[PDB]
Every structure is written in C-alpha cells, then in structure tokens.
Amino acid sequence: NLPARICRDIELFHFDIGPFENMWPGIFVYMIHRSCGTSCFELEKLCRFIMSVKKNYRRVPYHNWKHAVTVAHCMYAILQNNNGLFTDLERKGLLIACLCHDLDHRGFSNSYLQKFDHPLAALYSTSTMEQHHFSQTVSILQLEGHNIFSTLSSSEYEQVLEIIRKAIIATDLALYFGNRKQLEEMYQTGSLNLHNQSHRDRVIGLMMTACDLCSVTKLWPVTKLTANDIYAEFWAEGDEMKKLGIQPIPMMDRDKRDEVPQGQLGFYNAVAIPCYTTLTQILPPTEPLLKACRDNLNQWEKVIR
Numbered sequence: 001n002l003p004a005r006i007c008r009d010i011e012l013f014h015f016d017i018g019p020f021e022n023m024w025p026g027i028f029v030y031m032i033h034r035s036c037g038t039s040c041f042e043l044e045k046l047c048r049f050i051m052s053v054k055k056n057y058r059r060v061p062y063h064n065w066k067h068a069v070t071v072a073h074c075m076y077a078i079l080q081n082n083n084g085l086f087t088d089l090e091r092k093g094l095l096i097a098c099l100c101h102d103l104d105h106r107g108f109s110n111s112y113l114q115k116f117d118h119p120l121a122a123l124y125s126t127s128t129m130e131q132h133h134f135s136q137t138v139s140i141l142q143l144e145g146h147n148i149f150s151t152l153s154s155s156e157y158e159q160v161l162e163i164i165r166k167a168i169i170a171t172d173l174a175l176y177f178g179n180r181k182q183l184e185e186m187y188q189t190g191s192l193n194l195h196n197q198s199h200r201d202r203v204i205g206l207m208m209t210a211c212d213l214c215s216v217t218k219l220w221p222v223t224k225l226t227a228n229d230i231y232a233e234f235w236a237e238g239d240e241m242k243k244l245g246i247q248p249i250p251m252m253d254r255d256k257r258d259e260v261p262q263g264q265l266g267f268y269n270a271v272a273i274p275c276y277t278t279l280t281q282i283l284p285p286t287e288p289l290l291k292a293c294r295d296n297l298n299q300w301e302k303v304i305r
C-alpha cells in the first residue's frame with residue numbers, strides 16, 4: 001500500500017521510482033489500477049505475471065528491471081495527462097508493453113549481436129532484441145496462471161498483443177528516426193489524423209521512444225547518475241567489439257570518455273529534443289518532458305564550459 005509522498009510525486013513526469021526494488025511491483029500495480037481500473041485484472045494473476053517479468057530481466061547496469069518500471073511510469077504519466085485519447089485496451093497494452101519491452105536483455109545492442117553472430121540474429125534479422133523481447137512476453141503470458149488477459153475475448157486478446165508487439169518493436173531506436181520524420185511532416189501539413197490506425201501506431205511509437213529515453217527528462221541529478229549506467233553498458237560493449245577485432249564507435253569506447261559531454265549534446269540535438277518537440281506538438285500536455293529535456297541540454301552545455 002502506497003505511502004503518501006509517492007501517491008503525490010508519481011503524477012510528476014520527473015518522478016524517480018527509488019532504490020527499493022520490492023516497492024516497484026506495487027508502484028506498477030497502482031499505475032495500472034489508476035489507468036485501467038481495479039476491475040480489469042485478477043490481482044493475484046497480475047502479481048504473478050509481474051514477478052515472472054522481474055525474474056527474466058537480468059542484472060545488467062541499465063537495461064534492467066528498474067529501467068522497465070521507469071519506462072512504464074513515463075507512459076503512465078503521459079496517459080494520465082491525456083485523458084480520453086487512448087482506449088482502455090491501449091492503456092493496458094502500453095503499460096504492459098513498457099514493463100516488458102526489454103525482457104531478457106544482455107546489455108548489448110542489435111548491432112553487436114549481429115557482429116558476434118549470436119543465434120538471435122539468425123532467428124530475428126531485424127530489430128533483433130525487440131523481437132526477442134516480444135517473444136519473451138508471449139512465453140510469460142503462456143505460463144500456467146500468468147495470462148493477465150484471460151477475461152478478454154480471443155479478439156481483444158489478439159488485439160492487445162498486437163498493440164504490445166508494435167509498441168515493443170518501436171523501442172528499436174533505429175525505427176524512431178523515420179517515424180519521427182513522418183510524424184513531423186504530418187503535423188506541419190495538418191495531415192495527422194488520430195482516427196487513422198497507421199497514424200495512431202506512429203504516435204504510439206513515438207510515445208514508446210519518449211518513455212524509453214525518459215532518463216533525459218528527469219531532474220539533473222537523476223539524469224546525470226542514470227547516464228553512468230547507460231555508459232557502463234556502452235563501454236562493456238565497446239570492450240567486446242575490441243575483442244572481436246572491431247574498432248567500436250566512440251560512444252562505446254571507454255578511451256573516449258572525456259568526449260561524453262559533446263556526445264550528450266549530439267544526442268540531445270539529433271534525438272531527444274526533436275523527439276519531445278514532436279510529442280509536445282501532438283500531445284501538448286506532455287510539454288514538461290520537453291522542458292526538462294531542454295534544462296538537461298543546458299546542464300550538459302554547462303559541463304562543457
């Protein structure tokens with residue numbers, strides 16, 4: 001049962017879920033309750049799903065259980081401040097998608113898996129980890145007593161899984177660049193139509209990027225510390241690249257760590273600011289994400305001087 005400070009602060013886009021792991025499941029239950037109703041999931045079925053999801057996240061520095069819940073929380077905040085736009089089913093699916101969207105991640109990029117010749121890259125040639133993440137989600141749903149969608153009709157079940165599939169695939173950031181370009185064209189020609197399912201999928205995709213990247217929308221101390229965990233995986237990957245005989249990109253090369261601030265500038269200019277700029281144009285109540293993103297861009301510019 002949620003303490004008062006969290007009942008309040010959880011509505012803030014910049015909420016941080018804290019260091020107490022055992023609290024995160026109740027945090028997610030509360031979010032899904034508040035967004036989708038307490039009559040919607042069988043409580044002990046949902047609990048069991050949640051613990052099995054936790055168990056199939058790995059102890060990696062960043063792509064871990066904490067990241068998953070944090071991304072779900074960003075989605076909760078977007079959904080709360082955009083009442084009436086998304087269906088019951090969409091809100092259920094998106095929150096579950098966010099919880100599940102990095103299942104069984106190793107802390108390595110699709111590119112590294114492809115260079116390594118990992119079996120997953122043979123099985124899923126594109127969006128490799130993201131296809132696996134969705135595969136893991138289904139496997140967990142098929143375990144005895146884990147079908148949190150058991151009361152929905154067959155049709156609604158296939159529907160919500162497809163919502164989840166597309167949302168998890170969309171977290172492959174390689175897809176974001178084209179998606180966002182399409183959406184910005186749509187916005188500026190006044191052609192964006194939320195009743196159009198393909199447009200709607202794009203908007204959900206962008207929301208999934210926004211949540212996945214949300215470390216850059218927290219207050220600076222959180223953003224800065226989260227970047228330590230992000231780079232710990234990047235640098236581990238570049239070491240691994242060095243071990244296959246391949247010179248890693250700078251971002252993954254620990255020997256170029258003094259360039260981290262310049263790198264952050266690059267990322268904010270080319271990815272984060274455009275992402276939340278476009279999201280605020282479509283969903284104006286998401287503006288606090290953009291403002292916090294800009295403040296962090298200013299902090300990184302401060303570090304450089």
Ligand SMILES: COc1cc2ncnc(N3CCC[C@@H](c4ccccc4)C3)c2cc1OCCc1ccccn1
Nearest residue numbers: 173215216230250251259260262263264266267270271
């Ligand atoms: C919050 O920090 C980041 C989070 C990221 N999350 C997912 N993917 C990334 N990258 C994937 C490959 C390309 C990269 C990118 C794309 C466009 C411009 C810049 C970077 C995005 C990320 C890069 C980040 O900054 C790390 C930024 C960085 C870049 C270079 C050297 C040191 N740090």
Ligand SMILES: [Mg+2]
Nearest residue numbers: 101102171172
């Ligand atoms: Mg991912």
Ligand SMILES: [Zn+2]
Nearest residue numbers: 101102171212
């Ligand atoms: Zn993620």
